[PDB]
Amino acid sequence: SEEIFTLQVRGRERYEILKKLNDSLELSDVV
Amino acid sequence: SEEIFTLQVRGRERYEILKKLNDSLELSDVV
Amino acid sequence: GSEEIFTLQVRGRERYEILKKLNDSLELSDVV
Amino acid sequence: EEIFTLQVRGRERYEILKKLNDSLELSDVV
């Protein structure tokens, strides 16, 4: 199984930063 | 109104890294 | 004891800016 | 591109930012 977690964020800039990092980790992780 | 953005994250370890970063970013008034 | 400060090297201005925002936030918040 | 520096206080803080930087070097998202 996999688990999807929800992280709630205030402030567009905060959200945009975290989205870029999430996207990067999706692509850099071995799986 | 205040917009709360949702960041969907696969996996506990990935979530915990991003949550730590969010913990910091939410304390920062100017990002 | 003492404190260690590490030089993080980042390629590219836009990548530098995102990591700078994070580091600046961490310096204030001290969450790590 | 140029390489820029950021001074990072403390090993654990350096390690989290290094993890992100290394990820970005692999993914090229930013």
Author numbering:
A (entry chain D), B (entry chain C): 301 to 331
C (entry chain B): 300 to 331
D (entry chain A): 302 to 331
Give the exact sentences the study uses for this entry.
The tetrameric transcription factors p53, p63, and p73 evolved from a common ancestor and play key roles in tumor suppression and development. Surprisingly, p63 and p73 require a second helix in their tetramerization domain for the formation of stable tetramers that is absent in human p53, raising questions about the evolutionary processes leading to diversification. Crystallographic studies on the zebrafish p53 tetramerization domain then confirmed the presence of the p63/p73 signature helix in p53 proteins of a subgroup of bony fishes, providing evidence that the last common ancestor of p53, p63, and p73 also had an extended domain with an additional helix that was subsequently lost in many modern-day p53 proteins as a result of divergent evolution.
To see whether the C-terminal helix of the zebrafish p53 tetramerization domain plays an equally pivotal role in stabilizing the overall architecture of the tetramer, we created a deletion variant comprising residues 302-331, DRp53(302-331). SEC-MALS showed that the truncated domain remained tetrameric at high micromolar concentrations, with the tetramers partially dissociating at low micromolar concentration. We determined its structure in three different crystal forms grown at different pH (5.0, 7.0, and 9.0) and ionic strength, up to a resolution of 1.0 Å. In all three structures, DRp53(302–331) forms essentially identical tetramers with orthogonal packing of primary dimers as observed for the full-length tetramerization domain. Analysis of the salt-bridge patterns in different tetramers further revealed that Glu326 (Glu349 in human) can adopt alternative conformations and in some chains interacts directly with the guanidinium group of Arg314. This observation of fluctuating salt-bridge partners in the truncated zebrafish domain supports molecular dynamics simulations on the human protein, suggesting that the stabilizing Arg337-Asp352 salt bridge is part of a larger fluid salt-bridging cluster that includes Glu349 (Lwin et al., 2007). Taken together, the crystal structures of the truncated domain show that, although the second helix forms additional intersubunit contacts that stabilize the tetramer, it is not essential to the overall assembly geometry, which is stable across a broad range of pH and ionic strength. In contrast, the packing angle of the H1 helices in zebrafish p53 is not significantly affected by deletion of the second helix, and the truncated domain has essentially the same dimer and tetramer architecture as human p53.
